[PDB]
Design a binder for these strands. Structure first.
Lengths: 56, 209, 120, 122, 114
RNA sequence: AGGACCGAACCGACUAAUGUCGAAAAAUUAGCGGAUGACUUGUGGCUGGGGGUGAAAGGCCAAUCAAACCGGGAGAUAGCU
RNA sequence: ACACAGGUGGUCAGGUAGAGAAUACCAAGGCGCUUGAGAGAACUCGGGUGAAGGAACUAGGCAAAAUGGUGCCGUAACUUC
RNA sequence: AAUUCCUUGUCGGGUAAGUUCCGACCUGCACGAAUGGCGUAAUGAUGGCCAGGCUGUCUCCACCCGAGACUCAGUGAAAU
RNA sequence: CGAUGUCGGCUCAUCACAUCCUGGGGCUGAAGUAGGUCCCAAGGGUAUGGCUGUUCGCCAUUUAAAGUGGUACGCGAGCUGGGUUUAGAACGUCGUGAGACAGUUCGGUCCCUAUCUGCCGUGGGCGCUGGAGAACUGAGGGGGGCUGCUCCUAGUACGAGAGGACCGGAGUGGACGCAUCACUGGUGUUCGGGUUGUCAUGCCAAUGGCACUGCCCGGUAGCUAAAUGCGGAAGAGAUAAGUGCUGAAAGCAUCUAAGCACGAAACUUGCCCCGAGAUGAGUUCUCCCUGACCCUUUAAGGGUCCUGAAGGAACGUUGAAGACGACGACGUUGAUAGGCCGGGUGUGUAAGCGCAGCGAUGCGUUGAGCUAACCGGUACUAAUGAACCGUGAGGCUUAACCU
C-alpha cells in the first residue's frame, strides 16, 4: 500500500494542476449605498437591496 | 416506422370486463410537429425532426428561435428525430398526432431510467453476498477477487464493478398498446416504461414480430 | 439515495434534532431575529412558520398544542397575543432569510432569519 | 411459499400428519413451490395405522400456502397453513380418499379431477 | 393528476356501501367454471381496509371447514358483484391483524349497535 | 453447617466483534466464571541469577528469560556476509 | 513517553419504583468529554425491522434471536439416597 | 477405544441420504491392572452427537437510524 | 532462503476444445421409440443436500445437461483458518533417557490509509482553424443468444403386437437479464395511537423529557422484492461436416480440376447501448459581430483608444440529477423552493364541556382531533438592476463557377 518509486517534481506539479483556487471574480455594488458586497449577501455595513435591514 | 414523443404521466390500471386488472402507464402524447426534414440530397439519409411542448421567451435562445422560425412552429422543449422508412412522406409543419398508434398492436418505448446514483456491485450486478458471520471480517458486501494472478497480471476490461446505475437510454419492446384516447392525447400501454413521471419518452412501433 | 425524500439530517440523531428546533423556536420568537447557519435557517422555517399558523386561531385547544410543542409557557404568551394578530392577513411567508457571510472560526455560511414584521 | 426443508401438513386422511419438502420438482434449480406444484416429500409424522408410514419418500402436491395465490384480478387468497395432498410416487393419483379444508380454483389441470371432486370448498 | 384522476373516476364504481373494519360482510364473487358463470358467496369479518381511490381494497377473514382464509378484494373490481354488510363490529383500531393469533372465544369481537 | 445455590462490589479472563502506522506496546463493547474462601486487597518485610520462586507453564524474577540487568575481561572468535 | 477510552487503597452515600449498593428516572453537586460546518453515494463499525420458509448456513446453530420475576400446582431415569 | 494401520471393518439404530454419533462383534497393526483397570451419582466458560424452541446463520437480501467515508475551513503525520 | 504466505471452502471469474446438454450430419448388428460410434461446432447453459478439513468419492433426489483441463494445483495488500504447520496435554508405539512418529486426539493472534499499471465511473484543459447553439450520420466497441413440458398434426407413418415418431404450428413453465411501483407485501427513529417507570411544567387535568424509537400497534412518500411487464427470436449473406447437378482429366465413371446449387445456436448482419479526441476531430439547420489609429527586424506582426454580439459562466431557488464536478428546471415578463388554502392519506371517536357511576370508567358532542415527503392551486417569503468571460467579418495555394 506504498509507493514503489518516489514521484518527481513533474508529477506533483501535474497533480496540483487542478488545485487552482479561483477568486470570486464577481462583485456586487449596492444600488443605494454604493458598497462592494457579495451578490445575495447583506453588505458589511448591513444594507441589502436598498434596505437597512441589519439595523446595527 | 416513425414514432412520437410522449411523456410519463404516471401509472394506472384498467379493469377489463372480466376483471383482468391490466396495469397501464399513462403517457400523454401531444401533437408533435415537424420542424426540419432531412433528405438524401444533403444528409444521405431521409428523416424528419420533430418537437413538442413549449418553452418560455426568456429561456428560448436566439439559435433555437431562428430554427423554429424557419419552420414557423412554436418552440417545443427539445428536438427529437426519427429515421424514415421510404414508404412514407412528410411536409414541414405537420402537427402529427397520436393517431398513428390507434392502429398498431405493439409498440416500443424508449426513455431515461431512474438515477440510482453510485451503486455497489450487489445492487448493480447482483453479486452474491459474502457470509455475514462465521468470522468474516470487514468484507460482508465487497466484490471479492477480480483477477487471477501473475499469468494475466491485469484486470480484464469489461469487469463488473461499482459505479453509476441509471440515466441509461434504456428501451423496452413488444409492449402491448391497451387503449388510445385521442381526446386528451392519451396513449395507454400495458407494462412499466422507464423514467420518472414528468420525463420525456420516445415511443415507436414494435420491430420484432 | 433519498429520491423524493425530505427533511435534513444535520448530523444529529432525531431526539437531538427535535430538541434544538424547539429551543431555536422560542429564540426566534423571543428576539424576533437571530443569527444562525444557513442550512439550519432553511429548515427552521418548516417549524416556526407552521407554529404561527396555529396561533392565528386562539383556542384552549391550540394553546395547549403551542405548549405541547416548544414547551414554553412564555412563547405561548408571546404568541396568541402579539404574533397572532400581527400576521392575521398574510397567508404564509411569516419569515425572512438574509445571507450574512461566513462564521469566523469554521467558515460556516451564517445567515440571518427574522420575522417579516420587524418594525415598531 | 414452499421450498426445500419446508414442513407442511397433510390435506387428507392419507396416513400421515406432518411432512417435509425435500425437493421441488420441475426445472433446474427450482426455488419455490406454490399451489399448483408437485413436490417430492418425505414423511415425518405418520398416523398409527395409515396407508403410509414414517420415512416414506413420495410425491405430493401442495394445496394451501400462507404466502397465498394471486388471481387475474389482483386479489390474493392467503390461507393460514401450508397443506399438501399426497400422491403415488410413480403415478400421481391421490392416495387418500377424503380431503379437508378448501383448496383453490387454480388447481384444475385435468390431472386432479379426483381432487377437486372432493374439495368441500373453492 | 388531472389526467390520471379524470381517467380514474371512469372505472371507479359508485354503489359501494360504506363499512368499517370489524364489520361482518357478505361478498358475492363472479366465479366462472368454463361456462358456468356463478355468483359464489364469501362471508368473513373485515380485518383491514385500504382507501386508494380506484385502488381501494379491503380484506376479510373466514374460518371455514378447517382453518382461516384471508382473502383480499379489489373494491372496484368487476369480479366482485355485491357487498352486503351483516354486522357492524365495534373495534377501535384500523387494522385488525391481531385476530390472526387468536381463535374462538379468544377471538369474538364486540357489537357496535350504535 | 457448607472450598453449598443465585447474583452486584471485588477478582478473573471462555466466546465474538472492533482495533492492528490502535484511544491502548494486550484494551473496548456485548455477553461469560468465582463471589464466607485453597477468597481478595492496602502497608511493611524476606528469598538474587546456575540462584530465587513455582497448585509445574520452562512459568515469573521491573514492557527483557532453556539462565536478568550494569560495568569489565573485550577491539572475545567469526575457514561466513 | 502525550491534556492517552487503561491502572490506583479508604470514607460519606438522599427521593420514587425495586429483594437490593442491580437497574430506570431525579436531588445536592458537577459536567457537554479542546476541531467544526455541510452532504445524506459505494463501502466499513454499532443498531432496529422484515413476507414465506426455519440450520437448507457452516469445520461447527460461531454469531444473533430466544427463555428470563414472584406465588401456588407439579416434576422422571438414576442416586453415594 | 483420546489407543484399530488396514478402515468409511461387518451388523443394528438414528437420517430421504450419516467417513461423525450410539449399541454390539472380537480380526487387541501395537488394551490391561496404582507410569492403575473397570464402573460411577453430582460437577464442567470441557470433546462428539440428536431433538424441541427460536431466530436474516441461509434461500436472498430490502429499508431505515446513527458514526466514518465525501465537500468547505484550520491543523497536519507515516510505512516506502 | 537480506521471505514466492502453502490444502480446502466462500467470492469473482476468464480462456482452450480432446463437447455433458442444445444445433447439423455419416454409418449401423438404424423398423419405429430409444441407443452405439465417428465428423463439424465453444453461442448460451452446465445442480440441491447427507457424510468427511476435505479435492475426491459414495449415497438420496432432480435436470435438457449436472463437461474435461489451463489460469502461481486462478483468486489471503478480498474473507475464512476446518486441514497442515510452533509453543500446552494425553494414547498407542519406539528409546535406558532427553525425545520421536504424512499415527492419533483436544486447544491454539491471519498486519498493510493504494504512488504506478490495470479496471469501473465521472470531471477539468486544450485541440477540432472566426465564434456559438442544438440535432444527427456513423467507423469502432459492448450487451444479449438457455431450454423444459403440454397440446395439435396423430394414436397417423412405422410396426406381429406392445409401443410409438420426422417435418411443422400453438400454449404454458423453470433459470438468467432489464425496466417499474399499478396490484400483494417489507421498511418507513420526520405520521397517528396504546402503555410501564420516573422527572418537570405551581397542583387537577392536559402534555413534554429520558429509559435501544423505552416497549409496542398500525402507517404516507420514497426505496425495494417474494410483486408486475418485456426480452432471447423470425428473416438475410457467407460457410463447416455433409448431400448434390453437370462434367473432362482417364471415349467409362466421378460432388471438382472449369462452372452452378444446398447446408448448423458458431462467423457478418438483424435486436439493444455507447460512440466524431474516429487528430482521417464528419454532415445538416440556425444565430452573432462588417470602428478608428500609430509602430515596425513591414511580419499569419506588435500596440493604443472606443466598442464587447450571439452565447457562456458565476450567484441564488433547486430537482424522481447527484460522492465532488456534472446533468435538468426556474430567476419578478415567476409556480423553482418553503409557507398558506383546499383535497387526499393514515391513525382511530382529541381537547374542553355536560350526564351516569363510590370509583376505575363509560356515553353524547364526533369518523372528531391531528396529519412527513403526496395531488391541484396561490407570489405571502426567497430567487436584485447590473457587473465578469467572450469581439469588432474570419490564412495561403489551386480549380470550377460568378465579376
Amino acid at each position: 500500500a506504498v509507493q514503489q518509486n518516489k514521484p518527481t517534481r513533474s508529477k506533483r506539479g501535474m497533480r496540483r494542476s487542478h488545485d487552482a483556487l479561483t477568486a470570486v471574480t464577481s462583485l456586487s455594488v449596492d444600488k443605494t449605498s454604493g458598497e462592494k458586497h457579495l451578490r445575495h449577501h447583506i453588505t458589511a455595513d448591513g444594507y441589502y437591496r436598498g434596505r437597512k435591514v441589519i439595523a446595527k | 416506422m416513425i414514432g412520437l414523443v410522449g411523456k410519463k404521466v404516471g401509472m394506472t390500471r384498467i379493469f377489463t370486463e372480466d376483471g383482468v386488472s391490466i396495469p397501464v402507464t399513462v403517457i400523454e402524447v401531444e401533437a408533435n410537429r415537424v420542424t426540419q426534414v432531412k433528405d438524401l440530397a444533403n444528409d444521405g439519409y431521409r428523416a424528419i425532426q420533430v418537437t413538442t411542448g413549449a418553452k418560455k421567451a426568456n429561456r428560448v435562445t436566439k439559435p433555437e428561435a431562428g430554427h423554429f422560425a424557419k419552420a414557423g412552429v412554436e418552440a417545443g422543449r427539445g428536438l427529437w428525430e426519427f429515421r424514415l422508412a421510404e414508404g412514407e412522406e412528410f411536409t414541414v409543419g405537420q402537427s402529427i398526432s397520436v393517431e398513428l398508434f390507434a392502429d398498431v398492436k405493439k409498440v416500443d418505448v424508449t426513455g431515461t431510467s431512474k438515477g440510482k446514483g453510485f451503486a455497489g456491485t450487489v445492487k448493480r450486478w447482483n453479486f452474491r453476498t459474502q457470509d455475514a458471520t462465521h468470522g468474516n471480517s470487514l468484507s460482508h458486501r465487497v466484490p471479492g477477487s477480480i483477477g487471477q494472478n501473475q499469468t494475466p497480471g491485469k484486470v480484464f476490461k469489461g469487469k463488473k464493478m461499482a459505479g453509476q446505475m441509471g440515466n441509461e437510454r434504456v428501451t423496452v419492446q413488444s409492449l402491448d398498446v391497451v387503449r388510445v384516447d385521442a381526446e386528451r392525447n392519451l396513449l395507454l400501454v400495458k407494462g412499466a416504461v422507464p423514467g420518472a413521471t414528468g420525463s420525456d419518452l420516445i415511443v415507436k412501433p414494435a420491430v420484432k414480430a | 439515495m433519498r429520491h423524493r425524500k425530505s427533511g435534513r439530517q444535520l448530523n444529529r440523531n432525531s431526539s437531538h434534532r427535535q430538541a434544538m428546533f424547539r429551543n431555536m423556536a422560542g429564540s426566534l420568537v423571543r428576539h424576533e431575529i437571530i443569527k444562525t447557519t444557513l442550512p439550519k435557517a432553511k429548515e427552521l422555517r418548516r417549524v416556526v412558520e407552521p407554529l404561527i399558523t396555529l396561533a392565528k386561531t386562539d383556542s384552549v385547544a391550540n394553546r395547549r398544542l403551542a405548549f405541547a410543542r416548544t414547551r414554553d409557557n412564555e412563547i405561548v404568551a408571546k404568541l396568541f397575543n402579539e404574533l397572532g394578530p400581527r400576521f392575521a392577513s398574510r397567508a404564509g411567508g411569516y419569515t425572512r432569510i438574509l445571507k450574512c457571510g461566513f462564521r469566523a472560526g469554521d467558515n460556516a455560511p451564517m445567515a440571518y432569519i427574522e420575522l417579516v414584521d420587524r418594525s415598531e | 411459499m414452499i421450498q426445500e426443508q419446508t414442513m407442511l401438513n397433510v390435506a387428507d386422511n392419507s396416513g400421515a400428519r406432518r411432512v417435509m419438502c425435500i425437493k421441488v420438482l420441475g426445472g433446474s434449480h427450482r426455488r419455490y413451490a406454490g399451489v399448483g406444484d408437485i413436490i417430492k416429500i418425505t414423511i415425518k409424522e405418520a398416523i398409527p395405522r395409515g396407508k403410509v408410514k414414517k420415512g416414506d419418500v413420495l410425491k405430493a402436491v401442495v394445496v394451501r400456502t400462507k404466502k397465498g395465490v394471486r388471481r387475474p384480478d389482483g386479489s390474493v387468497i392467503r390461507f393460514d397453513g401450508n397443506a399438501c395432498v399426497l400422491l403415488n410416487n410413480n403415478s400421481e393419483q391421490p392416495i387418500g380418499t377424503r380431503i379437508f379444508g378448501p383448496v383453490t380454483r387454480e388447481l384444475r389441470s385435468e390431472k386432479f379431477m379426483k381432487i377437486i371432486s372432493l374439495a368441500p370448498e373453492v | 393528476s388531472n389526467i390520471i384522476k379524470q381517467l380514474e373516476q371512469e372505472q371507479m364504481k359508485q354503489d359501494v356501501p360504506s363499512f368499517r373494519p370489524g364489520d361482518t360482510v357478505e361478498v358475492k364473487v363472479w366465479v366462472v367454471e368454463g361456462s358456468k358463470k356463478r355468483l359464489q358467496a364469501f362471508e368473513g369479518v373485515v380485518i383491514a381496509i385500504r382507501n386508494r381511490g380506484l385502488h381501494s381494497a379491503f380484506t376479510v377473514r373466514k374460518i371455514s371447514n378447517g382453518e382461516g382464509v384471508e382473502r383480499v378484494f379489489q373494491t372496484h373490481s368487476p369480479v366482485v358483484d355485491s357487498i352486503s354488510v351483516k354486522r357492524r363490529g365495534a373495534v377501535r383500531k384500523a387494522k385488525l391483524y391481531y385476530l390472526r393469533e387468536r381463535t374462538g372465544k379468544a377471538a369474538r369481537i364486540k357489537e357496535r349497535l350504535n
